[PDB]
Amino acid sequence: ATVLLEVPFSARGDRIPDAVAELRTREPIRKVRTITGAEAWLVSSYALCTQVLEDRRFSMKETAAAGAPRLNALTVPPEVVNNMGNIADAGLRKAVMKAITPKAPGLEQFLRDTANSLLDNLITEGAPADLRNDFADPLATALHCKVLGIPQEDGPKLFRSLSIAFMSSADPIPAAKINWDRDIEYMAGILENPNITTGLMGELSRLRKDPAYSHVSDELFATIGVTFFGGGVISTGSFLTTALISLIQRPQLRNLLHEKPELIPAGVEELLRINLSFADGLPRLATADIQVGDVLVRKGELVLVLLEGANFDPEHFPNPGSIELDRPNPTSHLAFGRGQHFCPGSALGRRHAQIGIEALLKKMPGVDLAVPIDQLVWRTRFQRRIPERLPVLW
């Protein structure tokens, strides 16, 4: 007798388990047990992943319901799971989305300047350098302070919440509440701070005092700052980190992008497609009985949309493990999700990675791992897959 198949399969973010393709072929929707002991349906084909993400009867909001089968414990208040819904209902969606595009004057130059400064500092100190802690994450943190309009010096303290805030835990996490409450207080102060006039928090600060938003809660305004800083930083920092591993492990690709930087956007799109940064399937709760492939999912059941299931599906992306810069369907991956909850920061996440990579390849054209790849230490029980340190030489 064996136990019900457990998820997640592996915290390693440098390779997809052979098991994923076997599951996709044999049983692209199948029952699994999550870290809480709850049962769930793991969906691993491109077709079924899209189906689930595009049917709102598979609800994000309802995953926060008391007594629901859980992927993991909430690390935010239950109402915050519906954060984008709350933003939309408040009439704030357009303004929030506009503030977090890479289009603001000076933003891309700021990114390039920041990347180059970080890289110059690594070069001065000499190899080995840690490209996560001393490049990708600092670049992500600087970017999000700029986007939010908050002081760069405040970034580190907000950043330090994230190793707990984005845990994927069987049980509630006391420290997550301590940090959440503290970071909310910080964002509340920012909204009352007359120095903060630019970026997302500058715009929210103004809308908060506009009559069209007088009955929008101060809690929501602060929540938007905490959730967008944390989500953006953890997502961009983690993605860039694991993309750099993928790049470094492909010297031919590294050289091509170095020689022809105009190909970096197409390269970043493939790096997004093959990215293993999301450690768990995206959770949804069925609000009706719904047929998904050979399974009738029942109302109240948990469904997990495995992004790498979709993104390595050879039926949609032939030779799925290979980076090919000339695919006919390059942005059709699910790295940013799909449907109602499609990532609002997709353009910014793309630009962060594109600029970081462009800068790294110019400054460190000889970049390579400084340790055998197996020596990377993969963070466990976390909502992202990331190496604790990424040691390189050049």
Q: Is 46 in the site for a copy of itself (CB under 8 A)?
A: no
What are the helix (H) ranges across 166-274? 174-192, 199-208, 218-248, 251-259, 264-273
Q: Is 357 in the site for a copy of itself (CB under 8 A)?
A: no
| Half-sphere exposure for 350 (CA within 13 Å, toward CB) | 18
Q: Is 96 in the site for ligand HEM (CB under 6 A)?
A: no
Give the range of 18-26, 178-186, 327-335, 357-365 binding a copy of itself by CB under 8 A. Answer: 178-186
Q: Is 138 in the site for ligand HEM (CB under 6 A)?
A: no
Q: Which strands form 368-369's sheet, in the order they lie side by side?
A: 129-130, 391-393, 368-369
Select from 82, 117, 169, 193 the one that contacts a copy of itself (CB under 8 A): 169
Q: How far is the CB of 186 from ligand HEM (least distance, A)?
A: 17
Q: Is 209 annotated as a binding residue?
A: no
Q: Is 356 in the site for ligand HEM (CB under 6 A)?
A: no
- Residue 247: contacted member of a copy of itself, ligand HEM, none (CB under 5 to 8 Å, by partner type): none
Euclidean distance between CA atoms 338 and 332, whole angstroms: 9
Q: Is 242 exposed, middle or buried (0-12, 13-18, 19+ CB in 10 A)?
A: buried
Q: How many residues bind a copy of itself (CB under 8 A)?
A: 31
- DSSP H helix total and E strand total for the chain: 15, 10
Select from 379, 383, 384, 385 the one that contacts a copy of itself (CB under 8 A): 379
Q: Which residue matches tokens 């009439």?
A: 91
Q: Residue 175 contacts by C-beta under 8 Å, 6 or more apart in sequence?
A: 164
Give the range of 69-77, 103-111, 295-303, 337-345 binding ligand HEM by CB under 6 A. Answer: 337-345
Angle, CA of 277, 109 and 153, to the nearest 5°? 70
Q: Which strands form 282-286's sheet, in the order they lie side by side?
A: 29-33, 39-43, 302-305, 282-286, 58-59
- Residue 249: contacted member of a copy of itself, ligand HEM, none (CB under 5 to 8 Å, by partner type): none
Distance in angstroms between the alpha carbons of the first and the last residue of the chain: 50
Contact 61, 80 (CB under 8 A): no
Q: Is 179 in the site for a copy of itself (CB under 8 A)?
A: yes
Select from 155, 231, 309, 387 the one that contacts ligand HEM (CB under 6 A): 231
Residue nearest to ligand HEM (CB): 345
Q: How far is the CB of 236 from ligand HEM (least distance, A)?
A: 5
Q: Is 348 in the site for ligand HEM (CB under 6 A)?
A: yes
Report in angstroms the alpha-carbon separations of 310 from 51, 61, 173, 334: 11, 23, 31, 7
Euclidean distance between CA atoms 63 and 240, whole angstroms: 29
- Residue 228: contacted member of ligand HEM, a copy of itself, none (CB under 5 to 8 Å, by partner type): ligand HEM
Indicate the DSSP class of residue 382.
B
Select from 72, 168, 235, 246 the one that contacts ligand HEM (CB under 6 A): 235
Q: Is 258 annotated as a binding residue?
A: no
Q: Is 10 exposed, middle or buried (0-12, 13-18, 19+ CB in 10 A)?
A: middle
Question: Beta partners for 387?
Answer: 378
- Residue 268: contacted member of ligand HEM, a copy of itself, none (CB under 5 to 8 Å, by partner type): none
Q: Is 49 annotated as a binding residue?
A: no
- Residue 344: contacted member of ligand HEM, a copy of itself, none (CB under 5 to 8 Å, by partner type): ligand HEM
Q: Is 262 in the site for a copy of itself (CB under 8 A)?
A: no
- Comparing CB distances to ligand HEM, the nearer of 156 and 365 is 156
Q: Is 343 annotated as a binding residue?
A: yes
- Comparing CB distances to ligand HEM, the nearer of 42 and 84 is 84
Task: For residue 330, report the phi and psi dihedrals to the nearest 5 degrees.
Answer: -65, -30
Select from 33, 57, 208, 389 the one that contacts a copy of itself (CB under 8 A): 389
Q: How far is the CB of 393 from a copy of itself (least distance, A)?
A: 7
Nearest C-alpha neighbor of 42 from the set 4, 12, 73, 14: 4
Mark the binding-site residues, compressed into ranges. 75, 83-84, 235, 284, 299, 341, 343, 383
Contacts to ligand HEM by CB under 6 A: 60, 84, 100, 227-228, 231-232, 235-236, 239, 282, 335-337, 341, 343-345, 348-349
Mark the binding-site residues for heme, compressed into ranges. 284, 341, 343
Mark the binding-site residues for substrate, compressed into ranges. 75, 83-84, 235, 299, 383
